Amino acid sequence: LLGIAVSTDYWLYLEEGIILPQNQSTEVKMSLHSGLWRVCFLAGEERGRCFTIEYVMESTVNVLKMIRSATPFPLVSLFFMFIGFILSNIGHIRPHRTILAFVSGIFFILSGLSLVVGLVLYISSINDEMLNRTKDAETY
Amino acid sequence: KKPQKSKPGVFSFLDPLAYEIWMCIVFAYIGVSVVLFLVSRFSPY
Amino acid sequence: KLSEQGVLDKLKNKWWYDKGECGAKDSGSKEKTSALSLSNVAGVFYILV
Q1: E-assigned strands of chain A?
Q2: How far apart are CA C11 and CA C18, in angstroms?
Q3: How many whole angstroms separate alpha carbon A52 and alpha carbon A96?
Q4: A127 lies within 8 A of chain C by CB
Q5: Is the CB of A124 less than 8 angstroms away from the CB of C42?
Q6: What is the spatial distance between Cα A62 and Cα A64, in angstroms, rounded to a whole number?
Q7: Which of C37, C39, C49 sits opposite A116 (nearest CB)?
Q8: Which residue in A108, A115, A116 sits closest to A85, CA to CA?
Q9: Residue A6 to residue A32: CA distance in whole angstroms
Q10: How many other C-beta atoms are found inside a 10 Å radius of the C-beta of residue A94?
């Protein structure tokens, strides 16, 4: 599930839009779904850019650059199930000399610890840039 | 720029108590814990 | 002549006061408090983990 999630660039949605006052309700202006490696841009002006973050193109781009600060910890997290499961295969063929299981179970526990660190660095990187927009009443 | 709500620091939870209190808590955390140890030495009952 | 009788001062009262104001009218009742973000309480998790 983490192997599917990292290559997937459908982590988070954004809908940049402008309000409409009365007998008129809403009007979208920009939209993209985001990824940790690279952005695959969406139906904002119908331009299908699977666009790398390291190349440029505002505040929604400032959202996208801060996502890279939470890149390494899921990459740290994916490797620790890679080292956790292969040592689990060793205990199935050769059950004796049982020390390898008790060590590999630590790497299951220490794997998700980086994921909680991974989500804390991720979600706090979303909400501060949610705060960092200048609060204008006309743009929802 | 009109100043907005600032970016919250990573240690923004210990904001409502000043720096000298947080030292005086822990220094009294130790000091009460030391004296509570030395009280129970002299007394069996 | 306009300054000794305050025509220019009234025109100063005219043009900077008629354009709409941004004073206590949006500092008065255009605030509601938000929920806490994660970033307000983020450092507790770093001490925890």
Answers
A1: 12-19, 26-34, 38-41, 50-52
A2: 10
A3: 49
A4: yes
A5: yes
A6: 5
A7: C49
A8: A108
A9: 17
A10: 9
